[PDB]
Amino acid sequence: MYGWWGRILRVNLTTGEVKVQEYPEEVAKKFIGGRGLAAWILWNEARGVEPLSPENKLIFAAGPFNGLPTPSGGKLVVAAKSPLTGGYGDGNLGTMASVHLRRAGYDALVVEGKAKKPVYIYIEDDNVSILSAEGLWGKTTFETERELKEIHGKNVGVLTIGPAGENLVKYAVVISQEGRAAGRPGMGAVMGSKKLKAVVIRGTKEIPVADKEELKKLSQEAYNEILNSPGYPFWKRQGTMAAVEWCNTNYALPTRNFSDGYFEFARSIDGYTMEGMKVQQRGCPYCNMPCGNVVLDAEGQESELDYENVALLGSNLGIGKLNEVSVLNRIADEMGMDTISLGVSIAHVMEAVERGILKEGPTFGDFKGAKQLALDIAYRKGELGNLAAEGVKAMAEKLGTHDFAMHVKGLEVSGYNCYIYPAMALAYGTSAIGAHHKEAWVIAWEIGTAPIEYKISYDPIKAQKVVELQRLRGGLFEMLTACRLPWVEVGLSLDYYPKLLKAITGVTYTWDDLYKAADRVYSLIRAYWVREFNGKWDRKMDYPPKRWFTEGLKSGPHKGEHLDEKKYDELLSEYYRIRGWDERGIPKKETLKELDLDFVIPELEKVTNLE
Amino acid sequence: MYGWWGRILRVNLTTGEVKVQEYPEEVAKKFIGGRGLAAWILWNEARGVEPLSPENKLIFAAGPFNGLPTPSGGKLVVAAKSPLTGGYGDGNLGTMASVHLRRAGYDALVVEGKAKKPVYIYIEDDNVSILSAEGLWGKTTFETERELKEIHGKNVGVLTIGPAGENLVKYAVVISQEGRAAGRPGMGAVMGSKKLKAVVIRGTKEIPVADKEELKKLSQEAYNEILNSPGYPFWKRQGTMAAVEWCNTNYALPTRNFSDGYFEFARSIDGYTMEGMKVQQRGCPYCNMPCGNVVLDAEGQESELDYENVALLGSNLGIGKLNEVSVLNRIADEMGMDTISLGVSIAHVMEAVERGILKEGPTFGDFKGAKQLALDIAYRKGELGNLAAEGVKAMAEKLGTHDFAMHVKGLEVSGYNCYIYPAMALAYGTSAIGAHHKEAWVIAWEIGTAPIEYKISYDPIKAQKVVELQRLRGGLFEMLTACRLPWVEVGLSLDYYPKLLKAITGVTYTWDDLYKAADRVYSLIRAYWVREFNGKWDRKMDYPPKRWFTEGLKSGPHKGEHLDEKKYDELLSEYYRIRGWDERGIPKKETLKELDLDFVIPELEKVTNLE
Ligand SMILES: O=C(O)CCCC(=O)O
Ligand SMILES: O=C(O)CCCC(=O)O
Ligand code: SF4
Ligand code: SF4
Ligand SMILES: [Ca+2]
Ligand SMILES: [Ca+2]
After folding, report:
1. What is the 3-state secondary structure (H, E, C) of A202-230?
2. Burial (CB count <10 Å: 0-12, 13-18, 19+), residue B557
3. Which residues are A18's β-sheet partners?
4. Dihedral of the CA atoms A531, A534, A535, A540 (nearest 10)?
5. What cofactors are annotated for this protein (chains A, B) (predicted)?
6. d(CA A318, CA A259)
7. Residues in chain A within 8 Å Cβ distance of B298
């Protein structure tokens, strides 16, 4: 076997037992890795279990691409049954943990059970131990990693959670190298429910590559393509921050709980501003186009800014000062909590206050008030903090504010307001893990322009794009697993991947073979949601926030415009027609059979009638 | 006598003698104050003196508006025969030292001679002493003021010099309240040559006011007008920083030693960027539209930004990040040196390195190298820091680089590139104190738009608008002396100034009275220049830098466009005709008499032939 190790390190914090699981090569080829392997493991190992119970599984899934020097391939997936959604949840992050874990002889690491007290996992090649972390508990992500490296050395990849993860804040994430995060659906709160404070990994093994010479050839070639791309220079200057002005220009910038798509103070939180405030630039391993743009916040503190962070914690909260937003950014990072859901849950809170629905809390534009709630959310201090820490879906059920509850399947919506963007809306509506732009960033194609540089329509070809995009973004790249920005941003050729995959694993994959795996992973994940939801499922699960229907843009040429329920629904059907799912959103026996997923049928058959 | 005290404080550092000179009421009425009063003094007392010798007079001249609550009337002028230009030089700065000086019973303070050791002047009403400052010498202006306040309390006005003054950097200035500055022509280098480290003032006296009730009402009315003007909200947001975009939009932004009028990275150093980097806002005494905007620099240090600082230290140096320009900004402030002349002297070096004339030194964009040269200049470290500390005119004489020496009369050009702006060019060419935009910021009128929100022409009416602007900017406002911005930026009616003066001094000044007074100040100063230049003088002293005539814009639709000498010469002649000067730029006998300057004629007649 080449590329894959075919080994999965298993760590039980309840029994303290550490073993290595050897899975079949066919399963490697079948799911390639990352989200694929993760999906495979959760179907089998996380059946009907509570997301915060010790029976849940936390998976750090890598891919054949990881551990080896491949263009921006130092990513990693973190999965487990989500405490936020209740279905499948996963995330990605660039970190040396990815390089060191695969070089330590593992394709993934699964963690079950829960420690009786705070602990951290230590992994150095074949030496794996569960050590006491009693002294780290309570510390920020930054400090935790720093102290651990002060002990073991700089040559280790470190994964940690902050108080937010510790206090089981619903959308807690996992952090690495101060800035890289993973797991919006609550991978951090799962890690936290297990009293697992961190993970330190060190690898030195030589990974078996089928064709060594071709890997160096392809990689070296892919880098140069990236370096000479016309988009390199600008990317290097603004990274994802360049979407701020772009989204404002297109009325897609979420402002005050997605109320409007235009923020009057975009310019003071935009990319050029970020540029004149940049003091450092970091990146994930093996990437020659770093986009970890670090600035100094309002308190002179370093803060790594990303578009999604600035949009949900900036324009979305009515705060138009980068130095200030950056302060909220840094807090989410050290507390270990998703910028998007945090910024969305606080925005939700801000509107309920202006509506007089909530007696107290910060309102739009209140920076100091927002900073306070964020910290209270992290430490779950106060009734409000404890509520906003549960996400907008849950918080809304309690308050009775589903009107402006911006989520899908439980997960809070990203930074693209789709009042007049059907394909993007459908992308949020169908995301495999809940509202997120990860899998289908169709908005750029839907408009015709891109940040690196209009008529509404529900043409059923839009659904086709989403599906095609999902296959690559929420599929191929979430399985290799590698960064998709070299392609999405500077236009690196997608041909390098099938060729690199063959140079590594020695297996030849046709783009059609890959689409199948991606479509396979999507039907298995959907299957998971259904099984876990106990057959309680219908096409509405795939619906965008009601607000994109009953309300409209509040300014500009498209003032008053929005999405239409009928045409959206008709577009959902096209999506289901292309995926092979029934009108309920569930795969059909022919599709499950067709995708090598027969074992799923009897199981879904036990919860509902299949088609 | 009302308004004026008719009293001037005299301190002789050499002999230590301290007295109070009484000056006539026609002298006050005649010259009103500030710059008016300073010119009368310099003409009489700084005859033939070495700008850096003990005989030179350091004047701190206030006016009828100072010491009283007048709209943004907390200004003060600093004058002396200039060390950089060799002619009449002066500056203006907002400082509590303006209020306290007048509340102590003085209209102005005149330091002469030279202390035998570091000393500072202490003033508290009638108690005036020359104290030892031996423990202060060497410390930054910021630190000097903080330390003195820790001793005498916060309720005082402090004026200081930094090591640039101490070391006699030719464009050394006087600083106050970290940020406020005065004296581009080297007032700080004169303060330093006297071994004078600071001046602490405190006043408690009540100033005689002709009409107490009117002054109140007029002031209350002026502030509200400011508060309600449409441009107020935006002025509060960007201050003078709004001039970067607007200047870039008009090809007026000095870029790489005035090489171009456009900067490709202007955005990351603009008012919107600044806006999102703002942590504090300060202002001068008695102003309800504060504009001292404080940002955090690349090093986390507070920096007070003003358009001119960012233009000559940013885009002019080819440095496109605002946090890095702010760093250079802070250095200027704490070292006590004019941001403008420092930036121009540096850009000149940068262009000199690039062209290979200089074998060592920084280049455009080299922030680290510019910061080092800036510190090397303040401390006069090395042949380079030493040459640069002399200004571009002197530096150019040494390097033989007259071609890209951006100065007029020895004083370096401001933040407005005039390849295609004949009025502004005439403004710099005729500025009383040498190149500056203080007296005539005509560029806005010439374009038809202003920052608070094209065909080249040499219409002789342009020479009229300059003279008109000078009467107000380089006259009325430097004599009162009050801030011009409330009128210039938000548009406060200029009609409050003649009424307020009247309500304070009791005298009725009509606009023609003011135009005559300002004109007197202009002919007197020119007189000073000619006399001190020993009759060696001609129209070329009023010419803009050669670069704008033999080179043109390098980009945009005006690419290649430049200024026509012949047509400019004609514009200058219209200027001399209007002012009543000969084709040599020297006042005409009939003109002097006309302005009550007969006493100038016998004196000038000793060096040249009058007309
Ligand atoms: O700006 C974003 O959040 C998305 C960047 C492009 C991508 O998702 O691939
Ligand atoms: O932007 C500047 O430097 C000038 C502001 C307007 C004025 O000079 O009055
Ligand atoms: S482009 Fe950005 S997210 Fe992608 S690998 Fe490079 S630094 Fe990481
Ligand atoms: S407008 Fe600015 S410079 Fe003028 S008095 Fe006010 S704070 Fe000072
Ligand atoms: Ca980040
Ligand atoms: Ca200043």
Report:
1. ECCCCCCCCCHHHHHHHHHHHHHHHHHCC
2. exposed
3. A11
4. -100
5. [4Fe-4S] cluster; tungstopterin
6. 10
7. 279, 296
Q: Kindly state the tokens that stand for B303.
A: 């920096």
Query: In units of Å, what resolution does this entry have?
Result: 2.4
Closest by CA to B90, choosing from B185, B172, B158, B171, is B185
Nearest chain A CA: its distance from B311 CA (Å): 14
Helices (DSSP H) in B180-292: which residue ranges? 187-193, 212-228, 232-238, 243-248, 271-275
Cβ atoms B320, A276 nearer than 8 A = yes
Tokens of A113: 């059970």
Amino acid at position B472, single letter: L
Decide: residue B510, CB within 10 A, 0-12 exposed, 13-18 middle, 19+ buried: exposed
- DSSP category for residue A70: -
b/e map B159-183, b = 16+ CB within 10 Å: bbbbbbbbbbbbbbbbbbbbbbbbb
Burial class for A7, CB neighbours closer than 10 Å (0-12, 13-18, 19+): middle
C-alpha of residue B135 to centroid of ligand 6, in Å: 26
Nearest CA in chain A to B237: A268
Give the three-state DSSP class for B16. Answer: coil
Contacts of B212 (CB under 8 A, 6+ apart): none
Determine the Cα–Cα distance for residues B341 and A78; give it in Å rounded to an integer: 57
Assess whether the C-beta atom of B72 lies below 6 angstroms from ligand 4. yes
Question: In terms of C-beta density within 10 A (0-12 exposed, 13-18 middle, 19 or more buried), how is residue A594 classed?
Answer: middle
Token digits for B522? Answer: 């202009």
Collapsed DSSP state (helix, strand, coil) of residue A176: strand
Structure tokens at B373: 């040269």
CB of A236 within 8 Å of a chain B CB? The answer is no
Task: Identify the three-state secondary structure at position B550.
Answer: helix
Closest Cα of chain A to B353: distance in Å? 26
Interface test with B, best of A277, A319, A322 (most B CBs within 10 A): A277
Atom 3 of ligand 2, residue of closest alpha carbon = B308
Q: Chain B 320-359, CB below 8 Å of chain A: which residues? A: 320-323
Per the CB < 8 A criterion, the answer to whether A142 and A169 are in contact is no
B532, two tokens:
């001190």
Solved using: X-ray
- CB–CB of B276 and A277 under 8 A? yes
* Cα B307 from Cα B311, distance rounded (Å): 6
CA geometry: angle at A325 spanning B314 and A436, to 5°? 120
- Beta carbon of B436 within 6 Å of any ligand 2 atom: no
Contact B594, B580 (CB under 8 A): yes
Q: Domains in chain A, please, with CATH?
A: 1-209 (3.60.9.10), 210-238+417-600 (1.10.599.10), 239-416 (1.10.569.10)
Question: What is the length of chain A?
Answer: 611
For residues B507 and B29, the answer to whether their CB atoms sit within 8 Å is yes
Place of tokens 């007296």: B439
Residue of B nearest to A279 (CA): B298
Residues with CB under 5 A from ligand 6 (ion): B 179, 304, 306
Query: Could you tell me which residues come within 8 angstroms of residue B305 by beta carbon, excluding any fewer than 6 positions away?
Result: B239, B241, B274, B293, B294, B295, B326, B329
Mutate to test the pocket of ligand 3, among A291, A306, A481, A488 (most ligand atoms within 8 A of CB): A291
Q: How far is the CA of B104 from the centre of ligand 4 (A)?
A: 23
